Amino acid sequence: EAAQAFENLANLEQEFGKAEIEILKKQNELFQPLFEQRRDILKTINNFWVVVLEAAGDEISQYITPEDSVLLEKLENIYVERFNEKEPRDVRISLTFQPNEYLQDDNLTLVKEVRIKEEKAKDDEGLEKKITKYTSQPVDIHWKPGKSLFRKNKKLPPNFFDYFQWTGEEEDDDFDGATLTIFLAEDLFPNAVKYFTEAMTEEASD
Amino acid sequence: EAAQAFENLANLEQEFGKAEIEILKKQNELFQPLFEQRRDILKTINNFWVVVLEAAGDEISQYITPEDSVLLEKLENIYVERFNEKEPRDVRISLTFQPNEYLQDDNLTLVKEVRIKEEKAKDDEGLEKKITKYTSQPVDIHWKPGKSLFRKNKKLPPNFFDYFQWTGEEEDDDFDGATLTIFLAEDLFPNAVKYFTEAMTEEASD
């Protein structure tokens, strides 16, 4: 009776979806006020977020170049927020910088908005398959002269700030912005103080 | 002022922890009847779980031996229960088998209970650090004569069923049971249908 089983599984997957949506809303309700309070504290701590970014594992460190790191020292805060009620997986990632040698003063807050939507795509023999698609508008950054950290061609390996130009709309792209978005929103941001504290208690190699 | 900030962060971490526990409880509350209904369905689909296990990736395949596969061909269900009301991260993982040549009939359900616990240890500086530890009691499997898949000693590269002998309290066993527990409970079990459907896709184009 496999036909019935898999039809029932499909029905059940829909219920799982509705439950996940309820959980996301509950999560946003409980954690956002705490993240807001945390944000006010973290802004007072020198180099908090650059230490966190470089201690969070390979998913981030694979992108961070020495030139990136210098700018990130002026990163005052990172905030992550699920802003779209009608699409609760959508995330806004905001980086707030102090004045620095890379960014013009009228562009010290870098905002990345990632739309995360259920889509479908024909597979093998033309069967529809549910996929979660991650897309975003490209974010133009007002770099000071000679200080742009945007690659112009994809011969160059992507650095951290290439994330802002990632759209998720290119078959081309080698930059896995979807995985980075998930890591930032679900791992790095919620566990920031732990990452910082672990980094501040790291020992030498010798 | 670093001192006041970090004191405040530590207090806030406690609130984050409480929120996290509440979310996990809510998540279990919504997902449990759905996973239970799914379990009854999957029970009817022969070789569902061996296909899922073989499609899971290196996290599983690194343990799977030819003899493991034979026994896993008789695997009827994998069920994950968060049984501890106080600690929603605790998991009871049950592997149910059809009658086979490896297991005595009185031991066709292999139950693994893994308990987590926020522990504490001093670093070389002298300061206590918070460490999340995964522990479990060894499970006595009633093998049929000369069919034990437990390794003789902690020397030969471990197979999948050595997991039931993993405790997490041995100073050096090479079996990373903590990672396997997490993968089973958070990845393989929730995404099982997708793993199965995808595997069936791929071996239908060949």
Q: How far is CA A69 from CA A46, A49, A72, A74, in A?
A: 14, 11, 5, 9
CB-count burial class (<10 Å; 0-12, 13-18, 19+) for A33 = exposed
Token pair in block for residue A100: 């620095």
Cα B103 from Cα B100, distance rounded (Å): 6
CB B116 within 8 A of CB B87: yes
> Distance of alpha carbon A139 from its chain centroid, rounded?
14
Report, in angstroms and rounded to the nearest whole number, the Rg of chain B calculated over CA atoms: 20
Q: Which of B27, B129, B201 sits opposite A124 (nearest CB)?
A: B201
3-state secondary structure of B88: coil
Q: Name which of A40, A114, A103 is nearest A77 in CA terms.
A: A40
> Distance of alpha carbon B72 from its chain centroid, rounded?
16
CB neighbourhood size of B80 (10 A) = 20
Return the residue matching tokens 């929103």: A185
Contacts of B30 in chain A (CB under 8 A): 19, 22-23
Backbone angles phi, psi at A183, to 5 degrees: -60, -45
Total beta-carbon pairs less than 8 A apart between chain A and chain B: 69
A168: left (phi over 0), alpha (psi -120 to 50) or beta: left
Do β-strands A130-136 and A91-97 pair in parallel, antiparallel, or remain unpaired?
unpaired
Q: How far is CA B149 from CA A65, A150, B67, B77, B100, in A?
A: 47, 54, 8, 19, 14
Q: At what angle do helices B2-42 and A2-42 cross, to 10 degrees?
A: 180
Do β-strands B91-97 and B75-81 pair in parallel, antiparallel, or remain unpaired?
antiparallel
CB-count burial class (<10 Å; 0-12, 13-18, 19+) for A192 = buried
Cα B91 from Cα B72, distance rounded (Å): 21
H/E stretch holding B113 reads strand B109-122
CB contact under 8 Å between A15 and B9, yes or no, is no
Q: Which of B15, B42, B123 sits opposite A34 (nearest CB)?
A: B15
Cα B144 from Cα B101, distance rounded (Å): 7
Cα B161 from Cα B149, distance rounded (Å): 6
Cα A180 from Cα B132, distance rounded (Å): 25
Q: How far is CA B13 from CA A7, A160, B182, in A?
A: 44, 28, 23
Contacts with A, B 76-135, CB within 8 Å = 123-125, 127, 129
Do β-strands B75-81 and A75-81 pair in parallel, antiparallel, or remain unpaired?
unpaired
- Technique behind this structure? X-ray
Resolution of the experimentally solved model in angstroms = 2.1
Token pair in block for residue B206: 């060949």
Cα B97 from Cα B115, distance rounded (Å): 24
Token pair in block for residue A93: 């990632």
Cα A103 from Cα A105, distance rounded (Å): 6
CB B149 within 8 A of CB B72: no
Cα A11 from Cα B95, distance rounded (Å): 25
Which residues, listed in sequence order, are joined to residue A75 by a DSSP beta bridge?
A97
3-state secondary structure of A139: coil
- A39, amino acid identity: R
Q: Name which of A86, A56, A65 is nearest A186 in CA terms.
A: A56
CB contact under 8 Å between B37 and A12, yes or no, is yes
Contacts of A193 in chain B (CB under 8 A): 9, 12-13
Which residues, listed in sequence order, are joined to residue B78 by a DSSP beta bridge?
B95
Cα B130 from Cα B119, distance rounded (Å): 6
H/E stretch holding B182 reads helix B177-183
CA nearest to B196 within chain A = A6
Q: Name which of B102, B203, B41, B10 is nearest A38 in CA terms.
A: B10
Q: Say how many Å lie between the first and final Cα of chain A, rounded.
A: 63
CB neighbourhood size of B152 (10 A) = 7
CB B197 within 8 A of CB A130: no
Characterize A161-185 residue by residue with b for buried, 16 or more Cβ atoms within 10 angstroms of its Cβ, and e for exposed. bbbbbbebeeeeeebbbbebbbbbb
Q: Which of A26, A31, A44 sits opposite B26 (nearest CB)?
A: A26
